């Protein structure tokens, strides 16, 4: 029982060939770290949630570079990606001092939805439910033609685009953390570090402390 | 277990046997004393070492002698 | 002091790891049936 | 924790004995049976012309206005709170004894 | 006891072999790292006001650990925490430090294992013996020559690192 | 009505059935705790207990430790928790070595493998829970004080 | 002879003084006796129990606890009908007391004397004499 | 057996389609902690109070009773509470609603035992529910505008805590 993606390695025992977006890639056997029946379902739901959040973040960063909604510019000014998260948070009760609750409203409603999914994942883990990973019944426009779970091909598409967007939004965040350019300026400025935008330190400035002292710090 | 001995000075008064809280001692037939009986120690694995037998014994030096030895669950009187 | 780094290396090891290891291994030896 | 109603759930106070805790009825009756007598006013500086419940209910709001700040040691909140709950716990205890046991 | 793969066994031989290969890497890496001054504030002496009496050293000048030494130690602390988590909660496939108690010991290699140039156990054990011997060799060379280990490693490699 | 009875119908066992011991509320809490909850592997029991214990461990070390008034207070508190967690894991390991004979059973806590599973889960969860507390305290100024940021 | 496990137990409301895990994993002791009355007695492990008219049965952790009850049952209720058993977790029930149907303080034929030393206690051997020798000090 | 409102959740055990206003919404399992009938009586009480509260907000915008402007100058939504505690109006309403709650407490014990339906006080003077089919849809509509008025009452009083305007004055003065 060898693996498809890596022919030489032995196939990871917990993975089943019946789970979408599977090519036998699990060298570290993260799928075997818990013996429980629903741990692989937890891992699959974690992958899909990470992928959906990442797709939203990647599209969000691109479109934020394209334009902004009316009035946003007079409040936040000229921040671009993670800095806009910081800028709102400097102007919000509890975290900062101001008249805004933008990231907090997002936390409120996402958190209501997420505690609901908390109960869903807990029920799905212990085998009390015959629900697959990622399925919340959300399919308002009939796209799977009678099943909200969707077809095997469209969930494979969802997982693959999700994995791509995880990588892509990670790239975009780090490219911003050093150039300050944001997605479209970075992709335009294919010679880069030559002229970069002065952008603020994040809420985690310690992480950018080996750049100059140990690493080259071309910027 | 504890080691319990009966010496031939036993007058067969049965007092050690009555005082024993763990039924270690009993009376066996004899012909060396007027009472026709001597104390015996057949169940010393149950001896807790209280030495109530020695207290009960009336001979000048004790006919019954307890020698405290290796400790067990029984001889340490442990209910746990 | 010459080799002044030695107390800051050896005192935590002798004072914490050394008893922590002999207590750990003595406990195993005193609690084994065979 | 949880509250059990007068109507029969499968709650058991111990291993095999089901016992209806009357948490709605006792808590409601004990609260009202203590708060209403306690409405009796008194022109004393602790009460301030109100009753013990009302001076207390007034002192919850005044200290809630300064929400992060706690009431001070000489603040009347603590004395009012201790006295109100002491009677309230006593009426709850006596109310549970009276209702659960005598059943009427 | 000692039937769990501890002591002079091939399990211990392999494990110490892996650590000495990593250690040769780490010694080379620190030689190159402090040769170019890429350890920040390498000479700066830590203050007991911030770190407490663990920072004290009692060398006549400064009476405190240097920042380079603390940074190297914190790097080792990273791989020690990894080491503990891998010892007590290992991976599903990973070779375990301790053994089942009734395990069958791997057969001892001997003077030299079969030359299997792959990512094999023969290559691992050969290179591990070589690295352990290299650790000793570097230690003795530095002690006798009087030079620092960092300098001794640089000279043996032909001053490539710095 | 009587609230105290013999324990599990046995008048001569060394226990009583009291409301603290055997109420529906108590039974509920005990049965749903990670140590006693059904459908949990010993490894998962260790993880949930470990996450809980490691998370609270960080706070007393950080707020009351020797380096509490320094800016390295949280780092010192986490490493102090990590040191306690490692010491406790050694305690768990040696308990397993001396308390359980080696048998194939692994889905019970009181087995040699099941204890080794539980110990593995507890160490991972403890470091995970302590790390989560470290992240939360590092970033949120309310947790760094006792809530004293508001005053 | 064998313990009839179905014998009813004295009415007791329980106590913390009863037996612990060592009784269910090492050994347990039981005592049975006949009562002519439905009367209150004192448990060796705690408070008071009521023995039922007819046959009673208890379980205790120590042999001394069964005999301490037997002493009390014979001194205040004049029940001499008590039989003490040892019970192992294998199910084996071992009759203990009175071992041959007759009380130990009464002589019985077929009892062999154990522990009996032919001389008086002063005639033992000095420890030096039996040092590095297996010979016993009782002569 | 899946929840209707939350498709990925199992149908709440204590909940049933016989209950008025049921949609399968209890993702937290609070219907098991407290008794479902106590919760129904509590919800219906909250429904009716907040329906009066929302209508009271709206009407007090639209008009006030004769002489009320004498007593309340500028107090609008919850300021009128503060000034009419001084006057006797709030104490009067508190006394009479507490009078009613005494028999409401008897009725809650009655519905706990199982004799009475929650929220059922037999108050149908104008015979609205006589048909037997209207009665069900009236129960559903009562809970629907009851829940909506709970949310609305909160959403107006907080809009007034922000601006001070009140509901209609918030709308007309954007
Ligand atoms: C968190 C992001 C954010 C922020 C900070 C703002 C902030 C602002 N917006 Mg924008 N807006 C947003 C998201 C945001 N909006 C979104 C998601 C939409 C939906 C497409 C809009 C649609 C929108 C419109 C259509 C308008 C604004 C306008 C305004 C300004 C209002 C001035 C005023 O008198 O209000 C009066 C307006 C309202 C109370 C509602 C309109 C204000 C600076 C207005 C503006 O630019 O005027 C200067 C305007 O006309 N916003
Ligand atoms: C009986 C002898 C003895 C005793 C009581 C001590 C006592 C001490 N030494 Mg040690 N030392 C000794 C011999 C001894 N020394 C010898 C002979 C050497 C040369 C190898 C050293 C080298 C040495 C160093 C390099 C350092 C100390 C340090 C210290 C201090 C802290 C403890 C420590 O880190 O130990 C560590 C000690 C060693 C690793 C050396 C081995 C200790 C001896 C040889 C073994 C004695 C065994 C003993 C007979 C039986 C003990 C078992 C007992 C339960 C029966 C403490 C004052 C530290 C210090 O100064 O801190 C301020 C430190 O850095 N010592
Ligand atoms: C503090 C309030 C209070 C007090 C003083 C009493 C007192 C009494 N109740 Mg009542 N009861 C109460 C609250 C109270 N109840 C509430 C809230 C409920 C509803 C849940 C009931 C429901 C109830 C029923 C259904 C029945 C009683 C009955 C009784 C009588 C005897 C049984 C009993 O509870 O013994 C309490 C014994 C005493 C109070 C006397 C002992 C004297 C000592 C000093 C006790 C003092 C305790 C405490 C310090 C007093 C606190 C007062 C205040 C500061 C809180 C007794 C007169 C029964 C009865 O006799 O019928 C009329 C009966 O059938 N009660
Ligand atoms: C708590 C609410 C409240 C308050 C504070 C008042 C207060 C007042 N009302 Mg109003 N009133 C109320 C509710 C209230 N009313 C209600 C619910 C009704 C029935 C719909 C009325 C119907 C009413 C009438 C018909 C009149 C008053 C009048 C008056 C005033 C008495 C003046 C006089 O000369 O006699 C007084 C300020 C009189 C007045 O002068 O008002 C202009 C008057 O004619 N009241
Ligand atoms: C059961 C009979 C009853 C009685 C005797 C009263 C008596 C009173 N009410 Mg109350 N009231 C009652 C029922 C009753 N109310 C009910 C069922 C409600 C509905 C919850 C209210 C709601 C209410 C409010 C909101 C107010 C009163 C007020 C008054 C006072 C009017 C004084 C005046 O000049 O009257 C002459 C006026 C009239 C006859 C007007 C018609 C007086 C204390 C007013 C007051 O000052 O409170 C103390 C006031 O503002 N009442
Ligand atoms: C029946 C329910 C209901 C309705 C119709 C409204 C309607 C309104 N509310 Mg209220 N609100 C409600 C419930 C409701 N609310 C509840 C339950 C709360 C919780 C306490 C609030 C808390 C609240 C606050 C704190 C604010 C509003 C505001 C608003 C207004 C603008 C809508 C807006 O900004 O949302 C934006 C909608 C979206 C982003 C949808 C996507 C609007 C008049 C705002 C306003 O202008 O009032 C001054 C405002 O600041 N509401
Ligand atoms: C596996 C993870 C499961 C949960 C996952 C949730 C989040 C996962 C995705 C996150 C990615 C998006 C980032 C969003 C970050 C939100 C940050 C945030 O909102 O913070 C939320 C809070 C508070 O943090 C801030 O609070 C401020 C006011 O002080 C503001 O109001 C802000 O809302 C908030 O950001 O942080 C915590 O949650 C801390 C943990 C819970 C603390 C409860 C109170 C403390 C209890 C202590 C008492 C116990 C006994 C003490 C003993 C005596 C002590 C002296
Ligand atoms: C499901 C459901 C529905 C729905 C829905 C919705 C809203 C679905 C949204 C789907 C989305 C937004 C998917 C987006 C994926 C993004 C990807 C794969 C890109 C990653 C970036 C990369 C590779 C890059 C890069 C880059 C690098 C690193 C450097 C940068 O300088 C620039 C650059 C860009 C070049 C609806 C409502 C229709 C109903 C239906 O019945 C059911
Ligand atoms: C070098 C080094 C390390 C190390 C290490 C190790 C495991 C060193 C082990 C050395 C050993 C076990 C040497 C054995 C020698 C026996 C001989 C030569 C006899 C033959 C007949 C570590 C990993 C701590 C990192 C550190 O940054 C540098
Ligand atoms: C203090 C004070 C007084 C007063 C007063 C008064 C009248 C106070 C009244 C306060 C009320 C009724 C607050 C209600 C808040 C409602 C909330 C938070 C619901 C949110 C819904 C959510 C989050 C989403 C729900 C949902 C949505 C659609 C999405 C998911 C699904 C679902 C979960 C169903 C006085 C009178 C003394 C005056 C004095 O001067 C000040
Ligand atoms: C909002 C906010 C923030 C934020 C933020 C965010 C969103 C941070 C996101 C970070 C992410 C998602 C980084 C992605 C890392 C993926 C990596 C490194 C893969 C690496 C390497 C390989 C070889 C992959 C190889 C692979 C390939 C090629 C195929 C073979 C298999 C495989 C090995 C799997 C902050 C922190 C800035 C703070 C700020 O105040 C506010
Ligand atoms: S020491 Fe106690 S138990 Fe042992 S024989 Fe003497 S009296 Fe009996
Ligand atoms: S008490 Fe002494 S003398 Fe009496 S029977 Fe026992 S051993 Fe013999």
Swiss-Prot record, chain B:
Disulfide bonds: none
Coiled-coil blocks: none
Enzyme Commission no: 1.97.1.12
Catalysis performed (reactions): reduced [plastocyanin] + hnu + oxidized [2Fe-2S]-[ferredoxin] = oxidized [plastocyanin] + reduced [2Fe-2S]-[ferredoxin]
Residues of the 4Fe-4S ferredoxin-type domain: 1-30, 38-67
Family annotation (Gene3D superfamilies): 3.30.70.20
Cofactor note: Binds 2 [4Fe-4S] clusters. Cluster 2 is most probably the spectroscopically characterized electron acceptor FA and cluster 1 is most probably FB.
Membrane topology: Peripheral membrane protein
Residues that coordinate or bind [4Fe-4S] cluster 2: 20, 47, 50, 53
UniProt GO BP: photosynthetic electron transport in photosystem I
Domain of life of the source: Eukaryota
Primary localization class, coarse: plastid
InterPro entries, per database record: 4Fe4S_Fe-S-bd, 4Fe4S_Fe_S_CS, PSI_iron-sulfur_center, PSI_PsaC
Location(s) in or outside the cell: Plastid, Chloroplast thylakoid membrane
Cofactor requirement: [4Fe-4S] cluster
Binding site for [4Fe-4S] cluster 1: 10, 13, 16, 57
Broad enzyme group: oxidoreductase
One Pfam family recorded for the sequence: Fer4_7
GO molecular function: 4 iron, 4 sulfur cluster binding; electron transfer activity; metal ion binding; oxidoreductase activity
CC annotations in GO: chloroplast thylakoid membrane; photosystem I
Function: Apoprotein for the two 4Fe-4S centers FA and FB of photosystem I (PSI); essential for photochemical activity. FB is the terminal electron acceptor of PSI, donating electrons to ferredoxin. The C-terminus interacts with PsaA/B/D and helps assemble the protein into the PSI complex. Required for binding of PsaD and PsaE to PSI. PSI is a plastocyanin/cytochrome c6-ferredoxin oxidoreductase, converting photonic excitation into a charge separation, which transfers an electron from the donor P700 chlorophyll pair to the spectroscopically characterized acceptors A0, A1, FX, FA and FB in turn.
Subunit structure: The eukaryotic PSI reaction center is composed of at least 11 subunits.
Name by which UniProt lists this protein: Photosystem I iron-sulfur center
Organism: Rhodomonas salina (Cryptomonas salina)
């Amino acid at each position: 029982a060898k693996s498809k993606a890596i022919p030489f390695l032995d196939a990871p025992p917990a993975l089943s060939e019946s789970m979408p977006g599977y090519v036998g890639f699990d060298p570290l056997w993260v799928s075997s770290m818990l013996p429980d029946a629903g741990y692989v379902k937890f891992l699959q739901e974690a992958e899909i949630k990470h992928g959906r959040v990442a797709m939203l973040a990647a599209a969000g960063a691109i479109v934020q570079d394209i334009f902004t909604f009316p009035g946003v510019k007079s409040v936040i000014g000229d921040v671009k990606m993670t800095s806009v998260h910081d800028k709102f948070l400097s102007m919000e009760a509890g975290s900062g001092k101001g008249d805004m609750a933008a990231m907090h409203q997002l936390l409120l409603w996402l958190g209501l939805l997420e505690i609901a999914t908390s109960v869903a994942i807990i029920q799905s883990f212990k085998g009390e439910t015959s629900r697959g990973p990622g399925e919340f019944g959300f399919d308002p426009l009939n796209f799977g033609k009678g099943n909200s779970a969707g077809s095997d091909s469209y969930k494979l598409k969802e997982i693959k685009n999700g994995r791509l967007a995880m990588i892509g939004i990670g790239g975009m965040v780090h490219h911003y953390l050093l150039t300050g350019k944001g997605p479209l300026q970075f992709l335009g400025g294919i010679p880069n570090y030559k002229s970069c935008v002065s952008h603020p330190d994040s809420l985690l400035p310690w992480l950018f402390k080996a750049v100059g002292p140990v690493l080259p710090k071309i910027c | 277990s504890h080691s319990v001995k009966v010496y031939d000075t036993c007058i067969g008064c049965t007092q050690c046997v009555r005082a024993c809280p763990c039924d270690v001692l009993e009376m066996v037939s004899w012909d060396g004393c007027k009472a026709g009986q001597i104390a015996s120690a057949p169940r010393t694995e149950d001896c807790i070492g209280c030495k109530r037998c020695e207290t009960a014994c009336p001979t000048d030096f004790l006919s019954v002698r307890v020698y405290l030895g290796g400790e067990t669950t029984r001889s340490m009187g442990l209910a746990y | 002091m010459t080799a002044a780094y030695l107390p800051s290396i050896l005192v935590p090891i002798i004072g914490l790891i050394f008893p922590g290891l002999v207590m750990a291994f003595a406990f195993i030896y005193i609690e084994q049936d065979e | 924790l949880s509250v059990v109603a007068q109507s029969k759930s499968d709650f058991e106070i111990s291993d095999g004995t089901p016992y209806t805790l009357n948490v709605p009825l006792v808590g409601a009756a004990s609260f009202i049976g203590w708060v209403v007598p306690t409405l009796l006013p008194s022109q004393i500086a602790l009460y301030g012309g109100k009753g013990l419940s009302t001076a207390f209910f007034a002192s919850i709001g005044t200290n809630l206005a300064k929400f992060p700040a706690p009431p001070g040691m000489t603040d009347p909140f603590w004395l009012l709170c201790f006295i109100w709950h002491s009677g309230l716990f006593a009426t709850m205890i006596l109310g549970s004894i009276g209702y659960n046991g005598y059943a009427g | 006891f000692g039937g769990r793969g501890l002591g002079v066994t091939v399990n211990a031989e392999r494990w110490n072999g892996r650590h000495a290969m990593f250690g040769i890497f780490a010694m080379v890496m620190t030689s190159y790292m402090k040769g170019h001054g890429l350890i920040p504030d390498a000479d700066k002496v830590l203050d007991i006001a911030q770190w407490g009496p663990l920072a004290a050293v009692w060398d006549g000048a400064g009476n405190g650990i240097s920042n380079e030494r603390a940074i190297i130690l914190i790097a080792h602390v990273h791989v020690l925490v990894v080491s503990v988590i891998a010892a007590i909660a290992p991976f599903g496939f990973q070779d375990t430090l301790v053994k089942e108690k009734g395990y069958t010991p791997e057969s001892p290699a001997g003077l030299i294992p079969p030359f299997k140039t792959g990512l094999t156990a023969e290559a691992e054990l050969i290179n591990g013996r070589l690295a352990m011997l290299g650790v000793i060799s570097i230690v003795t060379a530095s002690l006798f020559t009087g030079t620092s280990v960092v300098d001794t490693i640089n000279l043996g490699m032909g001053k490539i690192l710095y | 009505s009587q609230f105290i009875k013999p324990y599990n119908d046995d008048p001569f066992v060394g226990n009583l059935a009291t409301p603290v011991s055997t109420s529906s509320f108590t039974k509920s809490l005990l049965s749903n705790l990670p140590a006693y909850r059904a459908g949990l592997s010993p490894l998962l029991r260790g993880v949930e207990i470990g996450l809980t214990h490691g998370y609270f461990l960080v706070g007393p070390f950080y707020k009351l430790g020797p380096l509490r008034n320094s800016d390295v207070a949280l780092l010192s508190g986490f490493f102090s928790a990590l040191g306690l967690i490692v010491i406790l894991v050694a305690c768990l390991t040696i308990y397993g070595v001396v308390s359980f004979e080696e048998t194939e059973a692994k889905d019970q806590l009181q087995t040699a493998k099941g204890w080794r599973q539980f110990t593995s889960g507890w160490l991972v969860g403890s470091v995970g829970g302590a790390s989560f507390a470290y992240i939360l305290i590092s970033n949120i100024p309310f947790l760094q004080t006792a809530g004293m940021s508001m005053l | 002879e064998t313990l009839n496990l179905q014998i009813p137990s004295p009415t007791f409301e329980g106590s913390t003084g009863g037996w612990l895990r060592a009784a269910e994993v090492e050994e347990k002791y039981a005592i049975t006796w006949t009562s002519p009355k439905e009367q209150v007695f004192e448990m060796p492990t705690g408070g008071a129990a009521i023995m039922r008219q007819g046959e009673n049965l208890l379980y205790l952790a120590r042999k001394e606890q069964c005999l301490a009850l037997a002493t009390q049952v014979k001194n205040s209720f004049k029940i001499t009908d008590y039989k003490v058993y040892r019970i192992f977790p294998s199910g084996e029930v071992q009759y203990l007391h009175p071992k041959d149907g007759v009380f130990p303080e009464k002589v019985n034929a077929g009892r062999v004397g154990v522990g009996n030393v032919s001389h008086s206690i002063g005639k033992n051997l000095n420890p030096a004499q039996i040092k590095f020798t297996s010979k016993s000090f009782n002569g | 057996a899946m929840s209707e409102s939350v498709p990925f959740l199992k149908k709440p055990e204590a909940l049933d389609s016989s209950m008025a206003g049921y949609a399968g919404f209890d993702p937290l399992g609070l219907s098991s902690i407290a008794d479902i009938k106590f919760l129904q009586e509590s919800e219906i009480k909250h429904c009716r109070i907040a329906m009066l509260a929302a209508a009271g907000s709206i009407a007090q915008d639209i008009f006030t009773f004769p002489g009320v402007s004498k007593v309340v100058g500028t107090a609008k939504m919850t300021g009128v509470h503060d000034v009419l505690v001084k006057q006797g109006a709030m104490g009067q309403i508190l006394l009479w609603t507490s009078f009613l709650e005494v028999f409401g407490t008897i009725a809650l014990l009655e519905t706990l035992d199982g004799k009475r339906a929650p929220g059922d006080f037999k108050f149908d003077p104008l015979g609205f529910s006589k048909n037997a089919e209207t009665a069900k849809r009236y129960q559903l509509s009562e809970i629907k505008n009851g829940r909506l008025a709970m949310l609305a009452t909160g959403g107006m009083v907080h809009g007034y805590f922000i601006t001070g305007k009140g509901p209609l004055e918030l709308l007309t003065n954007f």
